[PDB]
UniProtKB/Swiss-Prot annotation:
Gene encoding the protein: DHFR
Lineage: Eukaryota, Metazoa, Chordata, Craniata, Vertebrata
CDD domains: DHFR
UniProt-listed InterPro entries: DHFR, DHFR-like_dom_sf, DHFR_CS, DHFR_dom
Name under which the protein is recorded: Dihydrofolate reductase
Recorded disease: Megaloblastic anemia due to dihydrofolate reductase deficiency: An inborn error of metabolism, characterized by megaloblastic anemia and/or pancytopenia, severe cerebral folate deficiency, and cerebral tetrahydrobiopterin deficiency. Clinical features include variable neurologic symptoms, ranging from severe developmental delay and generalized seizures in infancy, to childhood absence epilepsy with learning difficulties, to lack of symptoms.
Alphabetic keyword roster: Cytoplasm, Disease variant, Methotrexate resistance, Mitochondrion, NADP, One-carbon metabolism, Oxidoreductase, RNA-binding
Residues that coordinate or bind substrate: E30, F31, R32, Y33, F34, Q35, N64, R70
Originating species: Homo sapiens (Human)
Positions that bind NADP(+): 9, 15-21, 54-56, 76-78, 116-123
Coiled coil: none
Compartments reported by the entry: Mitochondrion; Cytoplasm
Amino acid sequence: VGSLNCIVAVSQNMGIGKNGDLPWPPLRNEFRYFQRMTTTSSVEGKQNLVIMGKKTWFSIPEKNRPLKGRINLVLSRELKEPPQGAHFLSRSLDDALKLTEQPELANKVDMVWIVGGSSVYKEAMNHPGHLKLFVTRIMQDFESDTFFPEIDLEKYKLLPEYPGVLSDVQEEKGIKYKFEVYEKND
């Protein structure tokens, strides 16, 4: 049972989405960091819980979801049901973190990762304790209909490097991006 971690890829004009798809072309290496980051479970036999919004869920290739080696929860205020492939639903992030201690999900979950979007991010970011936001800084802005909210620097610190994260600017299919890590401990 654990760990609130926000993982996002943003363009430079901060968009995170366009027509319920991503603004940029698909970066398969961007995706693998995505995957490695959210799958790696740290104890000898539990799993990370992934919390994302229903759009975002839909947003993933029908055949990619549920995202395997991972319990996946959709934040859904409005529906009688965890969509097919979903493992759970909760009306709020907090009912999301309560199944942790729930007999429901107590002996299962290691790390908790917010996979999106903007508004579930927006809750997380504001929430107490220890948070870690992992951001892929896409270097060229694209047209987006959604944005990633604002990093209150009075609370987030840019960490100068982080074990398992490349510092170097990456570049795939013509797009430069850097992985940057932030963190707070209220």
